[PDB]
Design a protein around this ligand. Structure first.
Ligand SMILES: Cc1nc(C)c(CCc2nc(-c3ccccc3)cn2C)nc1C
Ligand SMILES: [Mg+2]
Ligand SMILES: [Zn+2]
Length: 313
């Protein structure tokens, strides 16, 4: 009960900043997460025995793929921690509990392949879940882990709080389907500008939580340049493996997934910052002003990709 987690001084300081990298020491990531729950939620939010046992079962059910791995899980949870800590009073006790778990579980049992590749391969998951295929699987895996003897970190919630938290987590995880981001941001953009945005409207909070999940999910673009650049290698290593597998099915992959077209990565990064990342953190900054540093970091990294094209690196 009186047992805190305490990080070394540099981590204790830097973990509070949006651009924090969780480092190459896998064995510290669970402690880093528990630290974030204790400071975000309280030392009372979960039983430490049950949380530790949930954390390690979640870790086990992430696979050894270049990008959609345990490191991604914890990185995306740290971004949500940063957003929550800079927006103290805007979020209920339940949302703070649900969203850090949502981020940890958001890519559970990812195989390194897009929804499109499951569909063209005719993977069983594509018959079971016709839209947001992997994302319904990720939530399904979250529910399974919560139901292992000793793993129900929500046991001490009422029947109705329990139903509310699983519903926060479900929507949170479904919203990490980037296919749903564009429509969600357009609606949030119209609501902010016409002045109709209302954070007491549950359907409005849902869209805002949705945008936060896209922001934490893309947070690789908001790091210091060297982290951003090295994480891009991992993102493309998966994409190019999927390109390879598309070709084995007799289908030319889109350029993004074709290793033959590596040359075009800088222009592809420009497109992505302009069409997806910058709009995302822009709308997020309007709704939640203290998240401006993510927009600032994203703009700095757009500038770094501009320099790559200009042959300056
Ligand atoms: C978080 C994240 N998510 C995505 C999806 C990407 C891919 C960025 C992209 N590259 C291309 C591209 C690349 C090479 C050749 C042709 C096209 C097209 N697009 C959209 N990058 C990051 C950092
Ligand atoms: Mg995902
Ligand atoms: Zn993800």
């Amino acid at each position: 009960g009186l047992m805190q987690f305490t990080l070394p001084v540099r981590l204790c300081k830097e973990i509070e900043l949006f651009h924090f990298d969780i480092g190459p020491f896998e064995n510290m990531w669970p402690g880093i997460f528990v630290y974030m729950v204790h400071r975000s939620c309280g030392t009372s939010c979960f039983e430490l025995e049950k949380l530790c046992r949930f954390i390690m079962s979640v870790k086990k059910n992430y696979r050894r793929v270049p990008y959609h791995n345990w490191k991604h899980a914890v990185t995306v949870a740290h971004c949500m921690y940063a957003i929550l800590q800079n927006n103290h009073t805007l979020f209920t006790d339940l949302e703070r509990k649900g969203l850090l778990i949502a981020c940890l579980c958001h890519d559970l049992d990812h195989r390194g392949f897009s929804n499109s590749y499951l569909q063209k391969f005719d993977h069983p998951l594509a018959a079971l879940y016709s839209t947001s295929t992997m994302e319904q699987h990720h939530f399904s895996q979250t529910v399974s882990i919560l139901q292992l003897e000793g793993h129900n970190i929500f046991s001490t919630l009422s029947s109705s709080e329990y139903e509310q938290v699983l519903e926060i987590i479900r929507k949170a995880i479904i919203a990490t389907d980037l296919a749903l981001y564009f429509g969600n941001r357009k609606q949030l953009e119209e609501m902010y500008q016409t002045g109709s945005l209302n954070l007491n409207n549950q359907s409005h909070r849902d869209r805002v939580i949705g945008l936060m999940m896209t922001a934490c999910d893309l947070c690789s673009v908001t790091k210091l340049w060297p982290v951003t650049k090295l994480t891009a290698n991992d993102i493309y290593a998966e994409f190019w493996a999927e390109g390879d597998e598309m070709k084995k099915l007799g289908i030319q992959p889109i350029p993004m997934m074709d290793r033959d077209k590596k040359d075009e990565v800088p222009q592809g990064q420009l497109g992505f910052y302009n069409a997806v990342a910058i709009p995302c953190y822009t709308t997020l900054t309007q709704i939640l002003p203290p998240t401006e540093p993510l927009l600032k970091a994203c703009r700095d990294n757009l500038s770094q990709w501009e320099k790559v094209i200009r042959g300056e690196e």
